[PDB]
Amino acid sequence: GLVPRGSHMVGLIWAQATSGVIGRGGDIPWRLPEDQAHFREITMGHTIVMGRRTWDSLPAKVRPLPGRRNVVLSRQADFMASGAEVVGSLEEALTSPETWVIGGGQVYALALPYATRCEVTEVDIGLPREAGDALAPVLDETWRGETGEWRFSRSGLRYRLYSYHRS
Numbered sequence: 001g002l003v004p005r006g007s008h009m010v011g012l013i014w015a016q017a018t019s020g021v022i023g024r025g026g027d028i029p030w031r032l033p034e035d036q037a038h039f040r041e042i043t044m045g046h047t048i049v050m051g052r053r054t055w056d057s058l059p060a061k062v063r064p065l066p067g068r069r070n071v072v073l074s075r076q077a078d079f080m081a082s083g084a085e086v087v088g089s090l091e092e093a094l095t096s097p098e099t100w101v102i103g104g105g106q107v108y109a110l111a112l113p114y115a116t117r118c119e120v121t122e123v124d125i126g127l128p129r130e131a132g133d134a135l136a137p138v139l140d141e142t143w144r145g146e147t148g149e150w151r152f153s154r155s156g157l158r159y160r161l162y163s164y165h166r167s
C-alpha cells in the first residue's frame with residue numbers, strides 16, 4: 001500500500017544470524033549477495049538513515065549508497081561523510097515521508113519505536129552472541145508478519161525473508 005505523502009513511514013531493514021547477531025568487528029560476519037538485492041529494492045529512491053559506525057562499515061565504492069538520500073547520525077559535529085548529511089539526533093533524521101533505517105544495532109534500537117515495517121533477512125548461520133556484537137532489536141507483540149521459505153544462496157548459505165508490519 002502506498003504511503004500518503006503527508007505522513008512519515010519509518011521502516012527498519014537488516015540481515016541477522018539466527019542468534020540475532022547482525023555485526024561483529026566492524027563488519028557483517030557473512031556475505032550474501034542475494035540479500036544485497038532485497039536491500040536495494042526496498043530502499044531505492046527513499047531516505048536512508050544509519051549510525052556513524054554503519055557509515056564507516058560501507059564499502060568505499062558505494063559510499064554514499066547511490067539513488068538514496070543518505071543520512072548519518074553522529075554526535076561528532078565535525079564528522080566527514082562525503083555525499084551524505086550528518087544529523088546529531090533522531091529528530092531531524094525522520095522527516096521524509098518514507099525512511100528506511102539501515103543500521104546498526106544502536107540506531108535500530110533508537111528508531112524502532114516509530115517504525116511500522118521491518119524487513120528482516122535471516123541467515124542460517126550459527127553465530128552465538130558475543131561481547132561487543134551488534135544485535136537485531138527485539139520486536140514486541142504489536143508486530144505481525146510473514147515468514148518466507150528458505151532458499152540456498154550460490155555459496156550454499158541458507159536464508160529466508162521476514163516481512164513485518166504494525167499499525
Ligand SMILES: NC(=O)c1ccc[n+]([C@@H]2O[C@H](COP(=O)([O-])OP(=O)(O)OC[C@H]3O[C@@H](n4cnc5c(N)ncnc54)[C@H](OP(=O)(O)O)[C@@H]3O)[C@@H](O)[C@H]2O)c1
Nearest residue numbers: 014015023024027051052053054074075103104105106107
Ligand atoms: N547485518 C546488517 O543488516 C547490518 C546493517 C548495518 C550495520 N551492520 C553492522 O552493525 C555494526 C554497527 O552497529 P553499531 O550498533 O556498532 O553502530 P551504529 O548504530 O551503526 O552507529 C552508532 C553510532 O551512531 C551515533 N549515534 C547513536 N545513537 C545516537 C543518537 N541518539 N544521536 C546521535 N548519534 C547517535 C554515534 O556516532 P558517534 O560515535 O560518531 O557519535 C554512535 O557511535 C557494524 O558491525 C555493521 O557492519 C549490520
Ligand SMILES: CCc1nc(N)nc(N)c1OCCCOc1ccccc1CCC(=O)NS(C)(=O)=O
Nearest residue numbers: 013014015028035036039040059062065102103121
Ligand atoms: C546488504 C547488507 C544489509 N542487508 C540488509 N537486509 N539490511 C541492511 N540494512 C544491510 O546493511 C546495509 C548497509 C551495509 O551495507 C553493506 C555491508 C557490507 C558489505 C556491503 C554493503 C553494501 C551493500 C550494497 O552494495 N547495497 S546497494 C546494492 O548498493 O544498495
